[PDB]
Amino acid sequence: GISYAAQGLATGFSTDTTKSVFAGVLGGKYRVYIDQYAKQDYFTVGYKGPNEMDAGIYYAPYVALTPLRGSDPKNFQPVMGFKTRYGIGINPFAILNSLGKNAYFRRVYVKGI
Amino acid sequence: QINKWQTAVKSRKLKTGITVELAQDLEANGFDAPNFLEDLLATEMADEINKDI
Amino acid sequence: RPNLVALTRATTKLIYSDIVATQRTNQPVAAFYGIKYLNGATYAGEAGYVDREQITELTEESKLTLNKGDLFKYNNIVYKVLEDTPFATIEESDLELALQIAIVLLKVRLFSDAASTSKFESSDSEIADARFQINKWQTAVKSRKLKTGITVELAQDLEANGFDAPNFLEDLLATEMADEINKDILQSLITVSKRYKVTGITDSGFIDLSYASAPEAGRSLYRMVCEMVSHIQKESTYTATFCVASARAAAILAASGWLKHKPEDDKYLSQNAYGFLANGLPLYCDTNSPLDYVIVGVVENIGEKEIVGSIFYAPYTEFKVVVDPESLQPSIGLLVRYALSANPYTVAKDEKEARIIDGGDMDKMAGRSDLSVLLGVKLPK
């Protein structure tokens, strides 16, 4: 169970599901996350150093989870919502210079499951 | 002689301080944006008033 | 970096910082902001526009079907009809002029859509849209660097001059840097400025005061320059705030009574100004460009922010001086970097185009300022 199903939540009859983070560590080596929107069936292996400049991929959460509020008088109903302004990027390896080129990650399609 | 008369107060409204995606840009420029925007908007208002005169 | 800040203070004071708008960055790129509107008069509300559409375009065949109380619009300006058949007595064939005549003779009346509060609130009428949009774009901070503080025997010379030399040389190096920067600013300004054109270019050709044309007094240029200011007033909600010209173009040419040599050096005039004109505007001079041109345009602010300009400048500090003893020569290197750009929205319909262009790409921004114009000038060399 090194890749965790959060078995204690199962044991307790879904005390949570926590379906948002890396499950655990495969082989005791790779932290494993679930692509909850996978289109076919696959895996990708990637590297991440301790240095933020050694990820190969960057996510920079400027303005995170900022709420909106309002009301629409036509039916006098509430307005509520969220916005973010994060931006992304990769080790340049020269989007046009990203496709199929970034050495930090290797993607394999899986069949036969 | 001194004359007097009464004239109705007329008005002009603007809905111009657009915020939304614009809010996000204004936030990016949040250093100045709150008051900057009101002064900018005031400026356009002043222009129309002056032109009316 | 206080040492660089001190150099910044002692170096940016030497450039034409006010012929462009100044913003600042703290990023490798500078986020610049600016304001633009594409057509100026009255309200910009939908209700306004709709009523205008619903009354008339004032065509020549319709101008006389109008009667007392009617509205019409022309070139987006709404006018009310005073008494019947406006223009019945105006023989002028150019409708725009006929309109100007009609306004003066009170056949028509400049019309205001201002109304009671109740009109607006009761009908749930539309509201004025914005006249100007505020744009943002970013460009890379670019730089120049010098190896010019030469030392070796030069150190010995500097030691001989050691009472001043340490600072003197850095100040001197900063000065030549400032000079090239100022010139760089002018190249960008020159490039972006729209070509002033009237009836096929400034009275059907670039102004020419050459021997074969009009080696007069320089008066005809002064007149044209003043008209360049008018152009700015026509096209934008600002009066010119500065002017720059070469010696042969105007800095000297207009010095026949329509140019002042800085009679006063501290009021409404920068320290870097060559002088100012009889029609105002601090006057600057390039002295380098083969063009021998004149530029008229506007820098303007909302509170502390120089939001309006054709060109925007945004320096990036954290004016670095480095001493490197190559072999026998501890020379001084000087590095200065800044963003400098034109508002890219003057060449874009919307963000999809703005997002694939660069305000720092002067091959696209050329002639697209709208906050400045340039007069090409032929001269009696």
DSSP string covering chain A: --B---HHHHHTT-S---TTS--EEETTTEEE---TT-SSSEEEEE---SSGGGSSEEE--SS-SEEEEEEETTTTEEEEEEE----EEE-----TTTTTT-TTEEEEE----
Contact in structure between C126 and C45 (CB atoms under 8 Å): yes
Report yes or no on chains C and A touching (3+ CB pairs under 8 A).
Answer: no
Contact in structure between C23 and C312 (CB atoms under 8 Å): yes
B18 touches C: beta carbon within 8 Å: yes
- C179 in any annotated domain: yes
Q: Which residues contact C294 (CB under 8 A, 6 or more apart)?
A: C221, C224, C225, C228, C243, C244, C245, C246, C249, C250, C374, C375, C377
Contact (CB<8Å) C127/B14: yes
Contact (CB<8Å) C304/B13: no
C43 touches B: beta carbon within 8 Å: yes
- What residues in B contact C41, CB-CB < 8 Å? 51
* Closest of A103, A113, A9 to residue A21, by C-alpha: A9
CA geometry: angle C122, B23, C40, nearest 5 deg: 60
Beta bridge partners of A66: A83
> Between B33-52 and B21-28, two packed helices, what is the crossing angle to 10 degrees?
110
Contact in structure between C298 and C240 (CB atoms under 8 Å): yes
DSSP string of B1-53? -------PPPB--B-----SHHHHHHHHTTTTHHHHHHHHHHHHHHHHHHHH-
CA distance to partner chain B, nearest, from residue C132 (Å): 8
Q: Are C272 and C212 in a shared domain?
A: yes
Q: Are C96 and C133 in a shared domain?
A: no
Q: Are C248 and C271 in a shared domain?
A: yes
- C373 in any annotated domain: yes
Nearest chain C residue to B36, by CA: C302
- C181 in any annotated domain: yes
* Closest of C270, C281, C296 to residue C190, by C-alpha: C296
Other C-beta atoms lying within 10 Å of the C-beta of residue C240: 26
Q: Are C215 and C286 in a shared domain?
A: yes
Q: What are the CA-CA distances from residue C229 to residues C55, C296, C314 (Å)?
A: 35, 6, 26
- C120 in any annotated domain: no
- What residues in C contact B33, CB-CB < 8 Å? none
Which ranges constitute the DSSP H helices of chain C? Answer: 2-12, 46-53, 95-104, 117-123, 153-160, 165-192, 219-235, 351-354
Q: What experimental approach yielded this model?
A: cryo-EM
Contact (CB<8Å) B13/C131: no
Contact (CB<8Å) C134/B40: yes
Nearest chain B residue to C110, by CA: B52
d(CA C31, CA C189): 19
Nearest chain B residue to C128, by CA: B14
- C92 in any annotated domain: yes
d(CA C245, CA C1): 36
Q: Are C63 and C29 in a shared domain?
A: no
d(CA C308, CA C22): 9
Mutate which of C78, C79, C127, C134 to disrupt the B interface (most B C-beta within 10 Å)? Answer: C134
- C121 in any annotated domain: no
Q: What is the resolution of this structure in A?
A: 5.1
- What residues in A contact B27, CB-CB < 8 Å? 63, 85
Q: Which residues contact A88 (CB under 8 A, 6 or more apart)?
A: A57, A58, A59, A60
Q: Residue C206: give its domain's CATH number.
A: 3.30.2320.40
- Subunits next to C (3 or more Cβ pairs <8 Å) are B
d(CA C106, CA C97): 14
Q: What is the dihedral of CA C364, C367, C370, C375, to 10 degrees?
A: 170
Q: Residue C106: give its domain's CATH number.
A: 2.10.10.40
Q: Are C227 and C92 in a shared domain?
A: no
Q: Which domain holds residue C98?
A: 53-113
Q: Are C290 and C175 in a shared domain?
A: no
Q: Are C217 and C293 in a shared domain?
A: yes
Alpha-carbon radius of gyration of chain A: 20
B25 touches A: beta carbon within 8 Å: no
d(CA C289, CA B50): 41
Report the domain count for chain C: 3
Contact in structure between A56 and A102 (CB atoms under 8 Å): yes
Report yes or no on chains B and C touching (3+ CB pairs under 8 A).
Answer: yes
Q: Are C134 and C182 in a shared domain?
A: yes
> Between C165-192 and C153-160, two packed helices, what is the crossing angle to 10 degrees?
110
- C45 in any annotated domain: no
d(CA B7, CA B5): 7
- C47 in any annotated domain: no
Contact in structure between C16 and C179 (CB atoms under 8 Å): no
d(CA C235, CA C232): 5
Q: Both tokens of residue C207?
A: 């102004």
Contact in structure between C22 and C306 (CB atoms under 8 Å): yes
State the count of interchain CB pairs (< 8 A) between B and C: 65
For C158, which DSSP code?
H
Q: At C154, is the secondary structure helix, strand, or coil?
A: helix
Contact (CB<8Å) A83/B28: no
- What residues in B contact C134, CB-CB < 8 Å? 25, 40
Contact (CB<8Å) B14/C132: no
Q: Are C290 and C304 in a shared domain?
A: no
Q: Are C29 and C86 in a shared domain?
A: no
Contact in structure between A67 and A82 (CB atoms under 8 Å): yes
- What residues in B contact A85, CB-CB < 8 Å? 24, 27-28
Q: Are C287 and C379 in a shared domain?
A: yes
